[PDB]
């Protein structure tokens, strides 16, 4: 999820852009034209607030560089299944309906008056005929990270932003479990993340192994996928892959074959499920403190793996060249008992 | 090369690059070797945890499994959250998430013999019958309403013992692990998703008593990796002045940061039973002198 968010990030500073001190404070505030293009929730907590956004779920860049947003045009008060993409200028020049507004199965507006968004910061009911455009889904303004926070319509803006930022700091555990409650944008956000392999053609698996897999295509071509095991991640954590397929199954194309870090059956899983209780207990949970049962400690429920990295080099010098050698002056045999011949 | 200060674990693999084997290397190097050390960390005190609703926290204490409160059927809880922080922060969503998680975990079966209840009119026809450890998903801005939760909480499947733990409101009767007697009032319980942040405790904890000293500034190194001491800001000097504490400030500025002979003598005195000798002239002052004397400004001392 962190990698996907970084790939989807929208920076506003750096070379060729304004600085922190010269940039005005107003630019850091929302604009009525941000709906559908840049999420208003996700944002760094630090001083770089408002200068780093994120694409919306359905946002697509036009060939010139103006962000677009899908819409279905109402011709005569009847919803149209076909959809078109509108930019800011064209969106302003038209009437955009509300997705949550009830609509009959035949496309007829049950309500004569439907709320609507207007030129700028204007919303007002209008007859159910002049309305021209309607949104696609209620989730058209949220970011990818914010789109997977259940009951987001009940929290506060600051709390929602804090949770969204926190979601990008999880640590891959040893035994992940899929959440019991979570939006439907979990598996899709994992398949597109790239950290999970997937079959290209519908074939039948001949044999599987902890280190590699071999799938037989229906055309008679054998293919093999190699899965890296315990390779240090770019930030110090571990990354692994465990195939979740059995020997002798005709796996269809597009079906996940292995689960990467923070995954469980081809869907994101950044944590576990714990039985919580809400009550002050002897002040040990005082002022945001937390109490944990030893069952978690003794069952590896929240056990993680971290891999360090060190390197040494022997570079030539004017006084000579350094060489790595088992022997070392004035050192007891016990100290170097671990070094090998080389 | 030696392991830095505060690292341990197994050695999983060693990569060595040699110029003899025709391996590209940075100019002026012959043998660069890297070693990977992997350590398994178990969650401990001083670790951050937080849900998906932005409610951070730290592990105040890890009580034994025999001390945590347990449900009426003997199922000890795994974590306890404070309540005063919910209404002030105004993040009531997590309560609904916990209720829904408990409902999904326990499994439900909404009555339909007499017909779909009015509150269950909009529920999908395939969502009226669930199984234990079921999976549910509420898309943002379109999910179960309050009435849906009210109805679901009233039809949860009973435990294998034949009794239902939680009430319609969602609260339950517990039993104190220490006193052994039930609490006077019910409490809310349920399953809530918990992540693990990257701000571990092992990285933060660090100590330094005596170690390598910088050669250019004559000051102890900095950073946990280098095994260096902590910084001492000027606000700390202001605070020390405020209390009127003088000898402490003198030590902090002279006998533990700069004075070489001072450090040696005080260390030896502590090793023995002798009293700590008074500090001397800090290296900073002597450097300032020998530098200001370079601008023809005769800086005398006037010891008299």
């Amino acid at each position: 999820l962190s990698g996907l968010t970084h790939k989807r990030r929208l920076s506003a500073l750096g070379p060729g852009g304004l600085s922190r001190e010269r940039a005005g404070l107003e630019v850091r505030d929302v604009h009525p034209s941000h709906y559908g293009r840049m999420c208003p929730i996700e944002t760094p907590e630090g001083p770089n607030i408002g200068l780093i956004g994120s694409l919306s779920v359905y946002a697509r860049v036009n060939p010139f560089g103006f962000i677009e947003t899908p819409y279905r045009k109402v011709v005569d008060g009847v919803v149209s299944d076909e959809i078109v993409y509108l930019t800011a200028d064209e969106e302003d020049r038209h009437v955009v309906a509300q997705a949550n507004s009830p609509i009959d199965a035949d496309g007829r507006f049950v309500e004569p008056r439907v709320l609507v968004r207007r030129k700028a910061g204007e919303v007002e009911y209008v007859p159910s005929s002049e309305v021209d455009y309607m949104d696609v889904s209620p989730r058209q303004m949220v970011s990818v990270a914010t789109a997977m926070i259940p009951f987001l319509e009940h929290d506060d803006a600051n709390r929602a932003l804090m949770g969204a930022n926190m979601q990008r700091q999880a640590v891959p555990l040893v035994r992940s479990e899929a959440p019991l409650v979570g939006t439907g944008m979990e598996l899709r956000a994992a398949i597109d993340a790239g950290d999970v392999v997937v079959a290209e053609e519908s074939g039948v698996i001949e044999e599987v192994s902890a280190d590699y897999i071999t799938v037989m295509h229906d055309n008679g071509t054998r293919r093999t996928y190699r899965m890296r095991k315990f390779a240090r991640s770019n930030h110090g954590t571990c990354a692994n892959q465990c195939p979740i397929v059995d020997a002798g199954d005709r796996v269809e194309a597009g079906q996940v074959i292995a689960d990467g870090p923070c995954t469980d059956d081809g869907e994101m899983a950044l944590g576990k499920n714990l039985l919580v209780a809400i009550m002050p207990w002897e002040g040990h949970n005082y002022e945001d403190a937390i109490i944990l049962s030893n069952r978690l400690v003794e069952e590896d429920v929240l056990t993680s793996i971290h891999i360090e990295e060190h390197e040494i080099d022997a570079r030539d010098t004017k006084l000579g060249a350094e060489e790595i050698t088992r022997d070392i002056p004035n050192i007891s045999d016990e100290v170097l008992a671990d070094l090998d011949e080389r | 090369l030696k392991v830095p200060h505060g690292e341990s674990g197994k050695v999983i693999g060693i990569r060595v690059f040699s110029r003899e084997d025709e391996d590209e290397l940075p100019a002026g190097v012959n043998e660069l070797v890297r070693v990977y050390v992997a350590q398994k960390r178990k969650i401990s005190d001083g670790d951050k945890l937080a849900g998906r609703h932005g409610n951070k926290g730290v592990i105040g204490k890890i009580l034994p499994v025999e001390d945590m409160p347990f449900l009426a059927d003997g199922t000890p809880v795994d974590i306890i959250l404070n309540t005063h922080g919910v209404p002030r922060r105004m993040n009531i969503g997590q309560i609904l998430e916990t209720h829904l998680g408990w409902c999904a975990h326990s499994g439900w079966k909404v009555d339909a013999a007499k017909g779909v209840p009015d509150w269950a009119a909009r529920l999908p026809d395939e969502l009226l019958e669930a199984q234990p450890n079921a999976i549910v998903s509420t898309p943002v801005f379109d999910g179960a309403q309050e009435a849906e939760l009210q109805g679901l909480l009233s039809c949860t499947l009973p435990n294998r013992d034949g009794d239902v733990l939680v009430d319609a409101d969602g609260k339950a009767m517990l039993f104190d692990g220490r006193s052994g007697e039930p609490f006077p009032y019910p409490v809310t319980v349920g399953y809530m998703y918990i992540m693990k942040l990257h701000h571990l405790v092992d990285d933060k904890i660090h100590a330094r008593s005596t170690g390598p000293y910088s050669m250019i500034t004559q000051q102890p190194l900095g950073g946990k990796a280098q095994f260096g001491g902590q910084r001492f800001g000027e606000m700390e000097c202001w605070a020390m002045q405020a209390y009127g504490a003088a000898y402490t400030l003198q030590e902090l500025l002279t006998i533990k940061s700069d004075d070489t002979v001072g450090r040696v003598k005080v260390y030896e005195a502590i090793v023995k039973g002798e009293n700590i000798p008074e500090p001397g002239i800090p290296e900073s002052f002597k450097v300032l002198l020998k530098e200001l004397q370079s601008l023809c400004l005769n800086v005398e001392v006037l010891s008299s």
Binding site: R72, N100, V136, R188 | P124
Partner: peptide, 25 residues
């Protein structure tokens, strides 16, 4: 409506249908 072949089954509190799948992220 699971676009991917073998994703786990998790019924949802669906009330409205989105006429287009999420584009390639």
């Amino acid at each position: 409506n699971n676009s991917v072949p073998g994703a786990p089954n998790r019924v949802s509190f669906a009330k409205l249908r989105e006429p287009l799948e999420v584009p390639g992220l």
